[PDB]
């Protein structure tokens, strides 16, 4: 600590190294994460005091400094001053990516490895925000450079994978947009299963979830009896099955020619 200070005031980031005029030391900048086979490293044998200047864009929470006096077998000192910096975490997520290995296998790629939670999201064709499916699903822990195995029965262009850390949204990868896209006008049905042969059918509408059959003037409530039939007839696509829940994607193209009388 008394040898390192940080100044983010010179519109850039400065590492003020407060050592004596005569001090000889090894300096190494690193990203505190397993990187693999031999990669070129950031290293400098110096004669301090020095000011190492970095760009606000280089900041990541695992960006650490290693110092050691230039003496044989000298011990190395490690400091991580960006662990809780707001800008670092900001840049970290800009550089993070979620990928598909298999439908039931996802992988997170990030420079640093922070605790994160992931869950499936449902995007409506009308531009309106992507509503996550918690419940009946849950935010499950997603670890950087480790496989996330979700029991997704089928991919859907309307499904996006959401990533949160520090209970804030950071990633929204619509994994089936190029492969199965664009967005289908399918109603999502959420049957919440429970005790005493319980199953409550609900329809994820832009204006929240509506239980079926309903007396509303809302598209899915009006078509309630028809959607309940599509499902029972097996015309609806099962996206997720569980002991206490099921997700269903019901296409609405069959109702595209239905018109109301004029009043």
């Amino acid at each position, epitope marked *: 600590l008394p040898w390192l200070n940080v100044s983010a005031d010179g519109d850039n980031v400065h590492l003020v190294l407060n050592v004596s005029e005569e001090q000889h030391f090894g300096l190494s900048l690193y990203w505190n994460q397993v990187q693999g086979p031999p990669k070129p490293r950031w290293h400098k044998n110096l004669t301090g005091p020095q000011i190492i200047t970095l760009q606000h864009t280089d900041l990541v929470p695992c960006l650490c400094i290693q110092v050691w006096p230039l003496e044989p077998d000298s011990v190395r000192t490690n400091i991580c001053p960006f662990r809780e910096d707001p800008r670092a975490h900001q840049n970290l997520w800009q550089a993070a990516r979620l990928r598909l290995l298999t439908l039931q296998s996802w992988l997170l790629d990030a420079p640093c490895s922070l605790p994160a939670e992931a869950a499936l999201c449902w995007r409506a064709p009308g531009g309106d925000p992507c509503q996550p499916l918690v419940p009946p699903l849950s935010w499950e822990q997603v670890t950087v450079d480790k496989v996330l195995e979700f029991p997704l029965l089928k991919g859907h262009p309307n499904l996006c994978v959401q990533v949160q850390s520090s209970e804030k949204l950071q990633l929204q990868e619509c994994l089936w947009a190029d492969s199965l896209g664009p967005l289908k006008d399918d109603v999502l049905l959420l049957e919440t299963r429970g005790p005493q042969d319980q199953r409550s059918l609900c329809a994820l509408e832009p204006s929240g979830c509506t239980s079926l059959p309903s007396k*509303a003037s809302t598209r899915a409530a009006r*078509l*309630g*009896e*028809y959607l309940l039939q599509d499902l029972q007839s097996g015309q609806c696509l099962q996206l997720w099955d569980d002991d206490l829940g099921a997700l269903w994607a019901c296409p609405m193209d069959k109702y595209i020619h239905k018109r109301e*009388f004029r009043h």
Partner: antibody, heavy 119, light 113 residues
Framework: QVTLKESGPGILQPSQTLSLTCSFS??????????VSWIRQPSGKGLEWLAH???????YYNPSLKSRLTISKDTFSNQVFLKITNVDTADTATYYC???????????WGQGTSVTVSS | DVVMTQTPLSLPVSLGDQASISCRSS???????????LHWYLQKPGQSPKLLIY???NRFSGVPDRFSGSGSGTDFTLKISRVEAEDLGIYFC?????????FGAGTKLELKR
């Protein structure tokens, strides 16, 4: 009182064109909101709506019969018409016209005209 | 098409009795404008249908207080309080929320003996 009277040939052969006329009194198709619908009823069966026309000439048809129906009107003569092309036995019915303004669809019906389609 | 399921199809009653007729639609009759275009008609032999109730519960001009309509969404009921001989005939429900406009099969209100 509102009165409507349907007219047309009593018997036609299959493939012929049925031309129906609804002559009315007690209302005008120049009146904003006013409309007239055509409905049919095969003997001892349920009613089947055919077509509707509003005062502004907006027209609606039964989608299953759409290509065979044409509804039209003559406001000056107080008449509404229905043309049904390529008739067949299923077109055998009593045909009704009914005053159908925007708030009260089919609020006054004519006494109907019987049509038999047979070879 | 919106199917109008009318029950019972035959309704034997005694004069002075109350009669109840049910109409269930295959989908909600609530229009985008918020109204429910469900009507009840009576048809007598050799005669044309006469409008009794419009928009679920509104009695048409000249219709007696003994006729009342109720219900919402997909479930509707016509109640006739003190059945008279002039009430005997076929009652039908109709909807005009959706194109095509559709009707129930009819309930024949008949006399018991």
């Amino acid at each position: 009182q509102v009165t409507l009277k349907e007219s047309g040939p009593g018997i036609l052969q299959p493939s012929q064109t049925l031309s129906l006329t609804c002559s009315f009194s007690g209302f005008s198709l120049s009146t904003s909101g006013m409309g007239v619908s055509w409905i049919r009823q095969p003997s001892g069966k349920g009613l089947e709506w055919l077509a509707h026309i509003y005062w502004d000439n907006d027209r609606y048809y039964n989608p299953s019969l759409k290509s065979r129906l044409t509804i039209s009107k003559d406001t000056f003569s107080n008449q509404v018409f229905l043309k049904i092309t390529n008739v067949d036995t299923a077109d055998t019915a009593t045909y009704y016209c009914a005053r159908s303004p925007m708030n009260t669809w089919g609020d006054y019906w004519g006494q109907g005209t019987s049509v038999t389609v047979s070879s | 098409d919106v199917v109008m399921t009318q029950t019972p199809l035959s309704l034997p009653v005694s004069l002075g009795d109350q009669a109840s007729i049910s109409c269930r639609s295959s989908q909600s009759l609530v229009h985008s404008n918020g109204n429910t275009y469900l009507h009840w008609y009576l048809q007598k032999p050799g005669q044309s249908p006469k409008l009794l109730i419009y928009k679920v519960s509104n009695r048409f001009s000249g219709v007696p207080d003994r006729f009342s309509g109720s219900g919402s969404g997909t479930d509707f009921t016509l109640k006739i309080s003190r059945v008279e001989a002039e009430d005997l005939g076929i009652y039908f429900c109709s909807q005009n929320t959706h194109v095509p406009l559709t009707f129930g099969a009819g309930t024949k209100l008949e006399l018991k003996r």
